[PDB]
Amino acid sequence: GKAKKKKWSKGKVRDKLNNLVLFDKATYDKLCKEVPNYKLITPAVVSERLKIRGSLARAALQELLSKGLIKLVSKHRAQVIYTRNT
């Protein structure tokens, strides 16, 4: 029937914002170019700053971890802690 609610707060963050499932060619190439420039390598910063989902972000961070460019400090439940040497 009718639709009623007591609060009036519309206009959320960004209009059902999209996020890339799979990495592109030039986008992931730019990611590999500017990825040593960050001081703290965390999956949330890599996901939200660089328009990456969490799954692809963790996959790319584990791939670069196996490559050895980024050192692991202490991994845990959900706060994965990486650091670049020097």
Partner: protein
Amino acid sequence: VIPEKFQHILRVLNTNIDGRRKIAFAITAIKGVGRRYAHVVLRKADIDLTKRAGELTEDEVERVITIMQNPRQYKIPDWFLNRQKDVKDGKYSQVLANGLDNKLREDLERLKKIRAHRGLRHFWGLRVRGQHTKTTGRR
């Protein structure tokens, strides 16, 4: 490392549109497929669960649709299916997205001819399993 595969939007059974998050959770979008049936069909198709919907072979898509339309040739015993013995035919089958609503309409159409009060409460604005409807069922 699978850079890019040109596959975003799929068309399954002429009505359903597959998503892009996974494959075992994009088969969830098909009506007649919920939580466990998709992970059963994935294990019958032997697909690695990390793979997306767009990173998957079209021949393997046809194999998954073959397992959808006929699961009883290989495995998946008679209890796991949705459409059990009460068919008017006795055929143990799994419903489709176009088939599920048609079977529900046939259920309601024969219940209106039976004139059971279950069908009567579904025809009225009532609840079948509504043991209390004082506060429950407003607007």
